[PDB]
From a paper:
The human α7 nicotinic receptor is a pentameric channel mediating cellular and neuronal communication. To develop a novel class of α7 ligands, we recently generated two nanobodies named E3 and C4, acting as positive allosteric modulator and silent allosteric ligand, respectively. E3 and C4 bind to a common epitope involving two subunits at the apex of the receptor. In this study, we solved five structures of the α7-nAChR in complex with two nanobodies, unraveling a common epitope at the apex of the receptor, which is formed by the MIR and the N-terminal helices from two adjacent subunits.
We then solved the structure of α7∆ICDcryo with a 50-fold excess of the E3 nanobody, with and without 100 µM nicotine, with an overall resolution of 2.6 and 2.8 Å in the ECD/nanobody region, respectively, and low signal in the TMD. Five E3 molecules are bound in a similar arrangement to the one seen for C4. The E3-Nic structure shows an ECD conformation very close to that of C4-Nic, including the five bound nicotine molecules, consistent with agonist-bound conformations of the ECD. First, E3 harbors the “canonical” disulfide bond that links the strands that just precede the CDR1 and CDR3, which is missing in C4. Second, the CDR3 of E3 is longer by two residues and is bent upward by the presence of an extra disulfide bond between the end of the CDR3 and the second β-strand of the framework region 3 (FR3). In addition, E3 shows a unique interaction between the Arg56CDR2 guanidinium and both the main chain carbonyl and the first glycan grafted on α7Asn23 (pre-β1), an interaction absent in C4 that harbors an alanine in place of the arginine at this position. In C4, Tyr60, Ser63 and Lys 66 contact n+1 Gln2 and Gln4 and in E3, Asn62 and Lys65 contact n+1 Gln3 and Gln5 and Gln 116. The CDR3 of E3 also contributes to the interface, the guanidinium of Arg108 lying near the carboxylate of Asp 113, suggesting a salt-bridge interaction.
Numbering used by the authors:
A (entry chain F), G (entry chain J), H (entry chain G), I (entry chain I), J (entry chain H): 1 to 124
B (entry chain A), C (entry chain B), D (entry chain E), E (entry chain C), F (entry chain D): 1 to 208
């Protein structure tokens, strides 16, 4: 919703679960889609998961297909990302980006600039 | 400046080729109405009727919406032709060489996403004039409007009564009324029914 | 929203200048048909015939296809002029100053890639009217349609019977039939044969 | 070269769809005036009046401004159609088939942001001619101009006296005056009042 | 698919404003010819002749070439207007208001780079009709075609005999022949000679 | 190939909206001339004169220049409409519905930056015909041309004598001469003087 | 205003305040908006704060939302950025960029090239 | 087919053969072309091989022209890349990308974003 | 003028002056503008100074505004850049770029590719 | 000609000559131009020399103007680059790129993607 901010990062142990929350502000949260990206320490930004503006369409990566989930909450203007069975290669910075009336796809040309994300680290 | 911000936000990810529906499984409702202003000419030899008419189309977009509290002072926007989705309403019984004789204007949208479109024009249509009862006779001329490429299950066309408040009386013909009727037909080209709206002129010759 | 996704996916890598064929070594089959609605005028002095006609062109794209199960609620799409390949069918014996007198409309495509195109128009053609047998005589006016730049080995044109279901009887002329015939000719410009379709009007004067 | 720099600087971030207002909560004031040059024809049978007229529209942009000291030698700029915001002034009682019969020209802007627009044209309008007093009679023909999509609270239209300095006398009709009047009306389409400006021709037939 | 690859390869680095010559120091040779089909009307009062004619222009590009062995199944391509260089051939003695009355069609190119262009049209030209020998007389009407902006040293125009194979005899005038001639003239505007091609109609009135 | 390189180099940083002047503080000099070819019609009832005319405009760009030694074989270039700056010369006393009736052609430029523009057309203008001296009388019809948005201090318009070398004598009217005159006027719209050029027809009726 | 130059950087201690000044020259300062960006030593440029050409609209980041403020002064052709309660992660190079009749948004496509900025360092 | 995922990587010895499989999901596999790219540890992404949507056109690099081969299988929605006589310089990450009705060319503008690839290493 | 080449670099001491010459070849030198850029060892390219095609307009950076000067010479087809009171941070590679009928502005979109420049180093 | 491959690299001593050959395949070699680029170990790609499709136009860099030469051979579908008096700074990777009906200019927008080049090293 115009301006999205992610939170919920921290330090977790391998095999645990984590819940990240992206809160919207500055506009109507029901008119935009939410997409998640990972920055990684020395790699490029990569798509993770996305949900459409109505919640009827969802998209996930291939290494996250079975372990992550995405949900919406218009009452709190918040999107929730649930990660289960975390692995050491999941340590990175997660950022949340909006998309006006998006279809919840992996295309990067329908999203806006991501905000300041949250760092998460997984220890073996 | 909030108008620039509103326009830039609205233009994002918009596709003029997409019907502005929220479900894709239900028809979009469009209200259609007419406003006659003058019967410029009635041609008997060529069986042609010329009139000045404003069309009225009303619908909803669901993609052009905003909170007025976040854009103070802005309550309506206007879009030119070719930048937003518009119904393809055409006159079936057209006699003009160009077929379509409507002057394209802007489309006005308010905060709720309601779009109105009122093109003015001078329409020529083929009508049959009977002169058997020359001194006294009532002529019925029909104008049929409908969507050309959008049929049932996609566009639900509803009718509204015609407006004759600004009608200018003619010196040789007197108007009795302009009744309208909505019908649905089947064409051999496709198995999908198509709706249409027909208006009647109901002119009468003045005995002088 | 699935309509946006479908449109965006379809538009990718599409080139309007390419004939939508799957082999490039076989002609593309196009079915052509006519639908007359009214003989507006028959000019004897100028040897010109005016009529209201809808053209019907049907073909297949093979590039506009999708699985309806992955795009629920979407079963047809519509494309405007200049965004997809379209046959260049023209009337050879045209008498209008513009030569081409067809109003361009949208092209409708279903899940299988079948494209239909039905432009309406008012066509003026040159016809020879014989008045030797004035009180009683049958006039034959021919309308010839064909592709201008696509010949044999590229576009295979097939004919379909004309539709006269919605024909409006004329007060001075009576229609007997509109037979059609497909022919193939050679022109001195090129050694490639070109097909064409010719329809006959077969009008008769009313004795009153 | 300073003209290139000025044009490049002005074009930045400009949106033709935005009304050039500084507050968004107040109407933009537009001054409208007419300049008649010749009454080319007066048609009695068809109730049509043909004249040659130049329109005059003046307003302010607030987005096209510069300091002349930083761009020496540059004091005015000109923009073509479709690159800057322009009022949609139209003639309500138009009789031309195209409805709009104005030739689009450039818009001139000076350092302060003042924009002028003077399109020339030949306008055909529907007028009622009374021939009861054939040898002696004065005919009143009205020309009504107004904004089509911009109403009150958005565009404040003001009137200026018509110019007849370059008028060419007609050999059969004599002009008495061209009074103008500004009015505001309500239409059933919207609850927002719309202003308009009406000019009168006041022709007189010459007794010869 | 090889058609897409061929089109994409051909479009690269192409500039429509460049004359498709290989040396830049030699003129490009263009062959011009005519094909008359019907003398629709001969106006004596207005000194105007109306006919249906197909133009024929042939030249070579040298930029649109490919090896058919690397693109199996592809032997010809077609380009619309405004995407490739085309000669600006115009009729000098035009009487139509638009001046140019040609319907633009596709340009066909084969593997060797040979381009053909055959626009159809209805041309109106000013001709002098002498009625001194009313019952018996032969009328000569000339049609002059030439390049408007390309003169000698740039475009070498060659003539080809006119085709009358598909000519439709007229009921009031009989054609004797359509001789053609190539000439070169000097104009006061420029010192560069300009070639042109003139065709003669040679009509004869039928004594009935 | 040097033509491609020259075109690519010239197109860089060019802005069609900028007047091609080198100082910005001095007017650009434009030479204007006429070339009449035929008086097609003289309408007395409607007070309209129809003629075939070629306009001639000459000026300098200063932005389109190159050294012929670095581009061997290239000495002239041609630019279409809308890609380079062009004067907005219009006919003030136009009677055509479109007002402007000129066919746009290419603009030719040589190595020194000199641009020529010769549009052909059929112009209709309003002229007063006096029939008091019916058998013997000389009619004076004036054609006034000028810039619409460029006035003094910006565009200095100079006149050149008209060319009648290719004039075709008329069967009913005889031309005596086409004198031209340059004038400068003030308009109430702006305080900047505007120049214009007026040509006279000087026709005479043939006594037969 | 055509050419903007930032100044006021220096060395400060954690928890202190700092005032940066961006001065305009080369044009009318009232026809342009002002945006602030941070370069950081080894990271990419990031938006910080922005103000519209009329001062009626302002925008801030999420980690700076409550601690920074932006103001205008047409008399001196200067924009002022006030930073309160500085933190160690705020050490970077700050640059000032103009935008003709900008809306004071975070979009980077409506701004011009930033000038030479000022380095600021925060010591724990 | 909308979403392509590559697999089959591992550790091999110089002079051996390897078979990589790119599986499609999310759409019709017969409407898209398949292209292969190599990332390399410290170099940029480079094209390797490609096949058209119908299998009638194929394209290869110059250092892979004689040693690699590409095949299709619509029954399993899988493209197969066979590498023979591997060399030490072939150690990299291989990624698979789709192209709707592609011609099997090396142009990068007709392909979509590549997915998460497979790492392969060759030991002398 | 189509092809510009810079020269005059060398080693100088802090507080001295230096004159760099950019010579044109391959076209008419009076139809193009000249712009100067600095590469720097580990930073990005930055504009320094520029002069219009007629010499009536000039533009400079903010750290070079008072110390550098630019002049033209059509007789020798050469642009001259004079640097006074050099500082240690001025050590970099200077490159010269043309612009056809340029206005002598800092915009990078109206210039062509820079050539091979000259290295200059300042020792404290 | 559609696909160009360069060869002829090796190790040479300073002051010697070297001949590199770029062979064409996949199309008509007479319809395309040939351009040469150098990659360098830690620098960006730079133009070196180019020849038009007809051989009537040639272009060279400024540090290579007098020492290098370029020639065509349609019989063997090969472009030849001759380098004389090599210098230590010429050690880099040379790549060959095609251009359909090119004018032999330095513009990079009229060329296609370069292929796999040849490494050349010069020892003092
Ligand atoms: C925008 O306009 C719509 C329609 O005019 C308003 O929604 C209602 O629409 C129905 C017809 O569809 C009208 O009968 C109602 O009167 C409308 N509600 C009103 C006028 O309050 C909608 O409220 C408008 N949005 C605004 C005013 O913010
Ligand atoms: C899309 O339309 C086509 C054609 O209407 C359907 O394919 C068949 O086409 C032939 C003519 O080419 C018809 O005679 C058949 O009746 C069509 N099959 C039908 C109607 O089942 C195709 O099935 C349509 N695709 C759909 C409905 O998903
Ligand atoms: C630009 O033009 C405007 C209007 O012509 C000038 O501002 C004043 O505008 C009012 C009408 O809105 C006129 O009555 C005044 O005469 C105008 N002031 C003048 C003419 O001094 C404005 O000054 C002009 N800008 C200039 C000349 O730099
Ligand atoms: C492409 O067409 C051209 C011209 O039709 C063929 O080249 C020759 O052109 C001349 C006229 O310029 C004709 O008289 C010859 O008959 C043409 N040669 C033929 C027909 O063999 C050219 O061969 C054609 N390319 C093909 C067929 O691949
Ligand atoms: C390009 O054309 C111009 C004008 O035709 C030539 O410059 C002179 O222009 C004046 C009128 O402005 C003529 O009277 C002269 O005759 C022209 N000089 C000539 C013809 O030598 C200019 O020389 C031309 N450039 C060339 C030929 O390279
Ligand atoms: C769309 O309409 C169908 C029936 O027309 C309905 O079953 C479905 O629930 C609707 N979509 C949503 C999101 O409710
Ligand atoms: C619009 O924004 C205001 C301010 O945040 C809020 O109170 C109001 O509920 C919003 N309107 C809607 C329809 O949510
Ligand atoms: C294309 O058609 C030719 C004959 O017309 C045939 O031999 C060929 O097999 C067809 N293409 C395919 C892919 O089957
Ligand atoms: C469309 O998708 C469904 C769901 O995966 C599948 O069962 C069906 O076979 C697909 N249709 C075709 C023609 O492959
Ligand atoms: C805009 O107008 C409203 C009233 O029309 C006024 O209250 C407001 O102050 C104006 N805007 C500004 C910036 O003054
Ligand atoms: C225009 O610039 C000059 C020179 O800096 C300045 O003196 C003048 O005040 C400026 N004009 C305005 C209206 O600020
Ligand atoms: C171009 O033509 C000139 C003479 O017209 C000739 O001297 C020259 O050799 C030709 N070009 C080539 C490449 O042969
Ligand atoms: C076209 O390609 C084939 C196959 O390589 C070749 O044999 C033939 O010579 C080529 N044609 C020409 C004109 O070079
Ligand atoms: C431009 O013209 C003015 C006077 O009209 C003159 O003073 C000035 O010097 C001219 N420009 C140049 C560069 O000479
Ligand atoms: C054009 O280039 C040639 C060759 O360098 C040169 O001799 C001549 O002086 C140039 N022309 C002009 C006007 O400078
Ligand atoms: C319902 N329409 C009106 C008459 C033709 C018909 C139609 C059907 C499909 C595509 N275009 C037009
Ligand atoms: C078959 N067409 C119709 C008449 C001309 C002919 C034709 C041939 C090639 C290119 N355009 C037109
Ligand atoms: C005021 N206009 C003139 C008549 C129709 C009316 C109108 C209202 C809204 C949108 N378009 C037109
Ligand atoms: C040869 N053309 C035909 C008549 C005008 C002349 C011409 C010359 C230069 C530019 N345009 C037209
Ligand atoms: C000089 N022109 C001719 C008549 C109107 C006048 C004019 C002035 C300013 C802008 N447009 C037109």
């Amino acid at each position: 919703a115009v301006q999205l901010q992610a939170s919920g990062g921290g330090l977790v142990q391998a095999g645990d679960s984590l819940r990240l929350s992206c809160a919207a502000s500055g506009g109507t949260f029901s008119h935009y889609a939410v997409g998640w990206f990972r920055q990684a320490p020395g790699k490029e930004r990569e798509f993770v998961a996305a949900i459409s503006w109505s919640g009827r369409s969802t998209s996930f990566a291939n290494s996250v297909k079975g372990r992550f989930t995405i949900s919406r909450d218009s009452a709190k203007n918040t999107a929730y990302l649930q990660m289960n069975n975390l692995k050491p290669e999941d340590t990175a910075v997660y950022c949340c980006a909006p998309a006006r009336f998006g279809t919840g796809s992996a295309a990067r040309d329908e999203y806006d600039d991501c905000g300041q994300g949250t760092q998460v680290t997984v220890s073996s | 400046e909030f108008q620039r911000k509103l326009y830039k936000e609205l233009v994002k990810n918009y596709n003029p080729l997409e019907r502005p529906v929220a479900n894709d499984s239900q028809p979009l409702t469009v209200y259609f109405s007419l406003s006659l202003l003058q019967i410029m000419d009635v041609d008997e030899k060529n069986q042609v009727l010329t009139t000045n008419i404003w069309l009225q189309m009303s619908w909803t977009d669901h993609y052009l919406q905003w909170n007025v509290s976040e854009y103070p002072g802005v309550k309506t926007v206007r879009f030119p032709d070719g930048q937003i989705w518009k119904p393809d309403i055409l006159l079936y019984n057209s006699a003009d060489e160009r077929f379509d004789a409507t002057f394209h204007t802007n489309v006005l949208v308010n905060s709720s996403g309601h779009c109105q479109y009122l093109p003015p024009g001078i329409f020529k249509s083929s009508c049959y004039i009977d002169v058997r009862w020359f001194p006294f006779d009532v002529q019925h001329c029909k104008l049929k409007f409908g969507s050309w490429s959008y049929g049932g299950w996609s566009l639900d066309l509803q009718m509204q009564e015609a407006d004759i408040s600004g009608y200018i009386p003619n010196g040789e013909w007197d108007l009795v009324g302009i009744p309208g009727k909505r019908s649905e037909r089947f064409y051999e080209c496709c198995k999908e029914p198509y709706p249409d709206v027909t208006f009647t002129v109901t002119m009468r010759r003045r005995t002088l």
